[PDB]
Amino acid sequence: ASATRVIQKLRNWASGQDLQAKLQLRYQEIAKRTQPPPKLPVGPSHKLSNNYYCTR
Amino acid sequence: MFFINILTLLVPILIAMAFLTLVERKILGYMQLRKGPNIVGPYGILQPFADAMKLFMKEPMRPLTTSMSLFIIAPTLSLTLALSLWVPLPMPHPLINLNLGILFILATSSLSVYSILWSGWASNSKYSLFGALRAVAQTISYEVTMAIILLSVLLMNGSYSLQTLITTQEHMWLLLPAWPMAMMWFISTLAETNRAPFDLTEGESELVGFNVEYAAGPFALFFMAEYTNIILMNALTTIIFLGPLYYINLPELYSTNFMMEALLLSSTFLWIRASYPRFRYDQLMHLLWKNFLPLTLALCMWHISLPIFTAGVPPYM
Amino acid sequence: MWFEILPGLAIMGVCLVIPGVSTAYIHKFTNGGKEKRVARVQYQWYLMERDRRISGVNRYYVSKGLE
Amino acid sequence: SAFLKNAWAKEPVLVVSFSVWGLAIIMPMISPYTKYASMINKATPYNYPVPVRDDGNMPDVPSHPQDPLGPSLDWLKNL
Amino acid sequence: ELVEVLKRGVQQVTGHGGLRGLLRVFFRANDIRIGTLVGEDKYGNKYYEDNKQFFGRHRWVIYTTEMNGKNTFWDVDGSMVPPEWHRWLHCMTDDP
Amino acid sequence: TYKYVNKKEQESEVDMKSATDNAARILMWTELIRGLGMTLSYLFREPATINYPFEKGPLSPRFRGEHALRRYPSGEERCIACKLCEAICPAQAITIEAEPRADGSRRTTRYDIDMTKCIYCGFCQEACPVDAIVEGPNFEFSTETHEELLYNKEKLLNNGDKWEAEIAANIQADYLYR
Amino acid sequence: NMTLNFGPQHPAAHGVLRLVLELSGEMVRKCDPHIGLLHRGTEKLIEYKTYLQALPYFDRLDYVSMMCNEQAYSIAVEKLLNIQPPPRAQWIRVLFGEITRILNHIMAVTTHALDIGAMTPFFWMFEEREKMFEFYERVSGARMHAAYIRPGGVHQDLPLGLLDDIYEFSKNFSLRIDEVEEMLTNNRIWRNRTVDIGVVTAEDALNYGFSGVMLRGSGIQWDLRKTQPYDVYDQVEFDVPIGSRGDCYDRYLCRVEEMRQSLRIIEQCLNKMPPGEIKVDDAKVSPPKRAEMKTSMESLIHHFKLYTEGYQVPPGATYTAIEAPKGEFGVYLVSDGSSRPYRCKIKAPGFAHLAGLDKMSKGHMLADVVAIIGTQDIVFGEIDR
Amino acid sequence: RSRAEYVVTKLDDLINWARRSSLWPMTFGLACCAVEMMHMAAPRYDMDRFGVVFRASPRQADVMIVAGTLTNKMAPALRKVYDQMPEPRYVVSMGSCANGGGYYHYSYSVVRGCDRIVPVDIYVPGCPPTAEALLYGILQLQRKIKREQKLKIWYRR
Amino acid sequence: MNLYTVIFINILLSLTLILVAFWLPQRLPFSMKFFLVAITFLLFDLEIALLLPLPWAIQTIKTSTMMIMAFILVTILSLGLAYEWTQKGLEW
Numbered sequence A: 001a002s003a004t005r006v007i008q009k010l011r012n013w014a015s016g017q018d019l020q021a022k023l024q025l026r027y028q029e030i031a032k033r034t035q036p037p038p039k040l041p042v043g044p045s046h047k048l049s050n051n052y053y054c055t056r
Numbered sequence B: 001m002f003f004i005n006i007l008t009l010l011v012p013i014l015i016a017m018a019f020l021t022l023v024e025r026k027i028l029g030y031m032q033l034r035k036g037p038n039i040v041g042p043y044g045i046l047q048p049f050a051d052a053m054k055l056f057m058k059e060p061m062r063p064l065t066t067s068m069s070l071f072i073i074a075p076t077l078s079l080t081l082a083l084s085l086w087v088p089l090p091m092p093h094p095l096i097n098l099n100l101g102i103l104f105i106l107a108t109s110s111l112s113v114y115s116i117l118w119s120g121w122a123s124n125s126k127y128s129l130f131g132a133l134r135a136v137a138q139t140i141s142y143e144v145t146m147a148i149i150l151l152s153v154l155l156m157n158g159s160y161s162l163q164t165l166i167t168t169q170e171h172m173w174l175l176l177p178a179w180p181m182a183m184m185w186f187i188s189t190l191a192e193t194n195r196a197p198f199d200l201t202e203g204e205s206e207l208v209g210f211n212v213e214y215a216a217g218p219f220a221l222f223f224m225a226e227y228t229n230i231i232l233m234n235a236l237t238t239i240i241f242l243g244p245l246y247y248i249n250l251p252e253l254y255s256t257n258f259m260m261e262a263l264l265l266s267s268t269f270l271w272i273r274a275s276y277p278r279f280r281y282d283q284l285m286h287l288l289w290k291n292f293l294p295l296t297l298a299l300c301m302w303h304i305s306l307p308i309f310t311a312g313v314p315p316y317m
Numbered sequence C: 001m002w003f004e005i006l007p008g009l010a011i012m013g014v015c016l017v018i019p020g021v022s023t024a025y026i027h028k029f030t031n032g033g034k035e036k037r038v039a040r041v042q043y044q045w046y047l048m049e050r051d052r053r054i055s056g057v058n059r060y061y062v063s064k065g066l067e
Numbered sequence D: 001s002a003f004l005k006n007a008w009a010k011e012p013v014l015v016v017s018f019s020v021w022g023l024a025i026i027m028p029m030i031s032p033y034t035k036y037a038s039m040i041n042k043a044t045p046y047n048y049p050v051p052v053r054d055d056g057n058m059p060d061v062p063s064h065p066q067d068p069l070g071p072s073l074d075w076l077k078n079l
Numbered sequence E: 001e002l003v004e005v006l007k008r009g010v011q012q013v014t015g016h017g018g019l020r021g022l023l024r025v026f027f028r029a030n031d032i033r034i035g036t037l038v039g040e041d042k043y044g045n046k047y048y049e050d051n052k053q054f055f056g057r058h059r060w061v062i063y064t065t066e067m068n069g070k071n072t073f074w075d076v077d078g079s080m081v082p083p084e085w086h087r088w089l090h091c092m093t094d095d096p
Numbered sequence F: 001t002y003k004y005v006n007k008k009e010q011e012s013e014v015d016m017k018s019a020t021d022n023a024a025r026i027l028m029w030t031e032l033i034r035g036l037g038m039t040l041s042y043l044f045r046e047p048a049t050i051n052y053p054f055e056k057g058p059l060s061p062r063f064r065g066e067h068a069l070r071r072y073p074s075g076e077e078r079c080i081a082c083k084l085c086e087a088i089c090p091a092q093a094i095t096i097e098a099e100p101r102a103d104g105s106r107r108t109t110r111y112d113i114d115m116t117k118c119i120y121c122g123f124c125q126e127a128c129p130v131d132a133i134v135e136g137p138n139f140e141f142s143t144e145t146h147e148e149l150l151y152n153k154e155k156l157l158n159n160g161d162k163w164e165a166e167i168a169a170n171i172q173a174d175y176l177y178r
Numbered sequence G: 001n002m003t004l005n006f007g008p009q010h011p012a013a014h015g016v017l018r019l020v021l022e023l024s025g026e027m028v029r030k031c032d033p034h035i036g037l038l039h040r041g042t043e044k045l046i047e048y049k050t051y052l053q054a055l056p057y058f059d060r061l062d063y064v065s066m067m068c069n070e071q072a073y074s075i076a077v078e079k080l081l082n083i084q085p086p087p088r089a090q091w092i093r094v095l096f097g098e099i100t101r102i103l104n105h106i107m108a109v110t111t112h113a114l115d116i117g118a119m120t121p122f123f124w125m126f127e128e129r130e131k132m133f134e135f136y137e138r139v140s141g142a143r144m145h146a147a148y149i150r151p152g153g154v155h156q157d158l159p160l161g162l163l164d165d166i167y168e169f170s171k172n173f174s175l176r177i178d179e180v181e182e183m184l185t186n187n188r189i190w191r192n193r194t195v196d197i198g199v200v201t202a203e204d205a206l207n208y209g210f211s212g213v214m215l216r217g218s219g220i221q222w223d224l225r226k227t228q229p230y231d232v233y234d235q236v237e238f239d240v241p242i243g244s245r246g247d248c249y250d251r252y253l254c255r256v257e258e259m260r261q262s263l264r265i266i267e268q269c270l271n272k273m274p275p276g277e278i279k280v281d282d283a284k285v286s287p288p289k290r291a292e293m294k295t296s297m298e299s300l301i302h303h304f305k306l307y308t309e310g311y312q313v314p315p316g317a318t319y320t321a322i323e324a325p326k327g328e329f330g331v332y333l334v335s336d337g338s339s340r341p342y343r344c345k346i347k348a349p350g351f352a353h354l355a356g357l358d359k360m361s362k363g364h365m366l367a368d369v370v371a372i373i374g375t376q377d378i379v380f381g382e383i384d385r
Numbered sequence H: 001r002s003r004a005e006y007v008v009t010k011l012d013d014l015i016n017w018a019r020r021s022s023l024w025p026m027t028f029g030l031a032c033c034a035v036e037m038m039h040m041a042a043p044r045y046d047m048d049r050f051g052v053v054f055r056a057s058p059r060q061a062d063v064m065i066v067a068g069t070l071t072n073k074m075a076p077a078l079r080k081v082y083d084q085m086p087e088p089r090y091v092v093s094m095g096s097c098a099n100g101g102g103y104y105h106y107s108y109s110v111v112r113g114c115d116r117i118v119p120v121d122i123y124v125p126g127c128p129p130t131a132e133a134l135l136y137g138i139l140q141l142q143r144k145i146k147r148e149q150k151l152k153i154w155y156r157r
Numbered sequence I: 001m002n003l004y005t006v007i008f009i010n011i012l013l014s015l016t017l018i019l020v021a022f023w024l025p026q027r028l029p030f031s032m033k034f035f036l037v038a039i040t041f042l043l044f045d046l047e048i049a050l051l052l053p054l055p056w057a058i059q060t061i062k063t064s065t066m067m068i069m070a071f072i073l074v075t076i077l078s079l080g081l082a083y084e085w086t087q088k089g090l091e092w
């Protein structure tokens, strides 16, 4: 991006595609770092009852 | 003064040779989403000089099994013929104008095929000999159509002297007429400089042949030769088919436009390289002998007929 | 950005115009401000030589009606 | 004809190749200018035209180049 | 249009101090680009960020002139960056 | 569900118009020109390369990188020589021998990670109960001599002290996930 | 016949290949590929290593399709333990499995072109490949050689930003395939170099055990992903790109289609990934969570034993095949009751393909052989093992 | 400055700069480390920028990067290619498989390091040594090449 | 002479390079196809010769004979090519 319109137009044409819509270089669209803290889910078998291993 | 002129033609051309290499390593880069060499020097300007010095310093290796002359004659011949062919070129004024100028360029090019043959025999390793034999064949084949394409041109120019075309192309480029051959001159110029679409002479994936046993100084000289040629042949396209505007009062606008057209067509074979896969050895000869030679021989006859029945026989001299 | 390729091209170009301007002014200096005569055919060499004999030793010097 | 068609679309070089071979073998035969080539080149004066003695028995030869007699290239002019 | 790009170019060139500064950057960092100093570590390295540029090149470090004695004018190596500021440079943490 | 690639559904019979279009494709290299346009297009795109020393390719917190041994904030090295980091190392890289320190505490007399043997799996990071051995962020530790790559307890502990601040931040970010 | 060997250093030889060629002139009449230059002893080393500490080895057999390789060991060991991965993990393995087939195909299509002489396609896609590794590194910590897919379930949950970033890559990736699509699919020069080269007939392909795009390219309709659906390949919809004729072009076109079809599968996985746990909840098979091992005795005992000794999978033997990007990758794991395996025969799609080179490269030039190896997508790690 | 010592220090500085700026590497291409460099050659971390040749035949190669395990069947070859490289030549060992045996150290078919076969100048660590990590290693070779003082040693020899 | 001056500088420049380059640092591959090509090449190369004077011959007063001759030469060689194609020649 950050390309003068004319270069973009030349780009889009020479390529035959609207390459601007889907640029390869990433700009402020990528997930920000330090995404929020994760509280992951505990799966089955964590029941404190009727959880006999012999049955699983 | 003549020497001054000798220096003015060779030194600048050689420097241009060097920077073509840099330009080849940046235009190919940006096409492939990469900056190319910019860290050594400012914007990579010192990059060509840097590896030249690395190449000359590294030990030249003479294979145990190698001739020691057909080995050192080969790069000397390659650089000598290529730099020599810039001697008789109209820009617009030629350093040594020769009445049979285009025959000089055709003959001098033809001699370079030996360097490939001599280097391949000299190396005495299988990869080199196989590469040289196919290579000589490519180069020679692309000479037969290369020559006929010029003969068609000359017959519409009236003479073999490259200086005449500046007067032939005072109203229109010879591309408009004869475009069908330009294309065929351009493709043949791509073969004779062993550039990409036709780089089987020295395929890398195929036989990593011409410089297999050549490193350091010998590598460089051919190397230099190839790139100077890359320019020269492009420059011949820019005189024979794309005729730069000539004004007798100011001779440099001829050279200014010669500069512009040569750089763009030199840029084109750089652009061709990155854009196309390399042709097969027989696919390459299939093109010249089947696709192009019948087109060229017939269009050759059309260029002996166009003059006569259009009462346009060109003025000798 | 592509403009970085330009520095290299410029240096190539400057080095491809020098030759054409150089050869075409080291001629107009050595030949006395007049383009070096191109003697394609003998007649021209004759006329050229004739000129030499006509004045000095160099053909570029050119005598006129006042001689 | 049908092959001709495919030939026009497959192996479309030879077709063009031959076509030109012929068109160059025809235009010369039929053209309003073909004759000029042998004239325009004939006229171009390269070797000095040596003058003949005047026996005085020749009314065809012009006694002076600018005379109203002799050959003319007005055909070349306004060609 | 084109004038704009030339203009931003001037900004960049004139931005890194005087010509002295530009040459300092032009020749050792090989990039005349202006960003916002996000901090200067005790070693001397100066870190900058330009969120406008692509992810790859929005955060850069202009290394010091001398680190731990050694001259680092030209012999710049990555490890020069301090461990604290290493993750900021590699985008491990979005916080300076 | 299948899909034919390169299967011509039917035999389009040549029509002059079709033939011309094709012949033009062979004669004037039309598709070849199409390919040149694509590369010219990118020539105008911004290059994706990064100044390597000045800018660095992004690595998130789990990047394994270079081994380090951490210490408790107090200053007591975390490792208690349970030696299962040695047990689960796939390459046999970690060598640990231990003896009760004078304090009476359990500690490793010798902890040697052979980095040339190590394949940076990150299981040691996983296995440690006190999480004393961690995969540190640094990846730039190329060394002139092979011996430098072999690492004893003092190099790793020193590596741990140098990168502890970032290691702590990285473990802080990813521990909920583990 | 002028015997000439395609020595290892040559770039077209994938680093290690000594094809003894007999050149009947430039036409090559016989090839005797001498592999073994990268045999590392991968399957004799595994016998001395516990099931978890042998996972890493499976990321290095085919080194361009790491996770799909480690999904074959993970499925095998899981079968021998009669345990199944949790629902979220199975989607994550299918999500990572298709990122790997896009990654292998970008490898195979672009490096084939590098061999033929087209250089730009490699650079455009390789930038798209580091975008992808980042996804490996952000989920496992290793750009390649992750060790993420574990014998039971996967190792750690996806970071909280990965699925958005995989959408942004998949959203724009297809234009990138479209772009090399234009630059290397109709070039007369490519077609001539690739079309009608190394044709393999349908029955010959089955007999030579080709089992891959080489099987599908000649028209045989076989995908282990739809025929024998492993993991969740029963809940995702895709079209196998069967080619018609078998030339190296039809095989290229199939590889380009599978990249497109994988984007269709990746889309479904992001759209339908279930909330849940990433590893089976049996502490006996998958290691206990970091907080649990540091607060509950049953978990420390289970962590200590699993890391130090192992799963101790029940005695048995299984051959589990998954559709790895190259072809059918299968592990014949024979197991005694011990925590370390007894035998692990890695079937490499590639040992069979390289055998076919002599038959496929028949009546062909020195240059054709470079295309023939390129269209088998052979990585010598899998062949040499 | 004026001293035969100063002229001989400046001129190697020149000779060292040329070798440093243009290192044409030759990758054997063993195992997978070759991929982690094909990524260095690729656009995110271009090597050419630094003056590095993506593909160079042995006779025209300054640096050999051994990526991947050196089995006991490829050893006899590596040495040949190292021996056939032009004299000014340097080796960078990439991967725990090459600098040391790495996983596969104890195998019967793997040489435990390429240092046993070819003298090694920089050892780049990591199972897939990251691509920046190789780029740091190549840059470390450039720091080693700057320090070399061949002309100074000949003068005071 | 002017050419001689230029050329010897040209050789000197190349010999200088190779010399510094070497001084500063201080069995049966045969396919008739290949031979056949070389031959064809000269048959074509000779023809190129018989075709080279055509620029001077254009100005010949005859013209009719010129073209009649030139067209016959190009056509008979092309037929040579034609038979080369028809035969296994040119089919490598």
Ligand SMILES: COC1=C(OC)C(=O)C(CC=C(C)C)=C(C)C1=O
Residues within 6 Å of the ligand: G011, G012, G013, G014, G015, G107, G108, G111, G112, G114, G115, G378, G379, G380, H027, H028, H029, H030, H031, H032, H034, H035, H038
């Ligand atoms: C993609 O397949 C392969 C290549 O060819 C394109 C190789 O070049 C190589 C090695 C190549 C070099 C010289 C880096 C390997 C390992 C490979 O797997």
Ligand code: SF4
Residues within 6 Å of the ligand: F078, F079, F080, F081, F082, F083, F084, F085, F086, F096, F127, F128, F129, F130, F131, F132, F133
């Ligand atoms: S596991 Fe952690 S603590 Fe136990 S020994 Fe290995 S490092 Fe020290």
Ligand code: SF4
Residues within 6 Å of the ligand: F119, G060, G063, G145, H030, H031, H032, H033, H067, H068, H069, H094, H095, H096, H097, H098, H102, H103, H126, H127, H128, H129
């Ligand atoms: S080191 Fe790690 S990555 Fe490099 S080869 Fe050996 S295993 Fe593959």
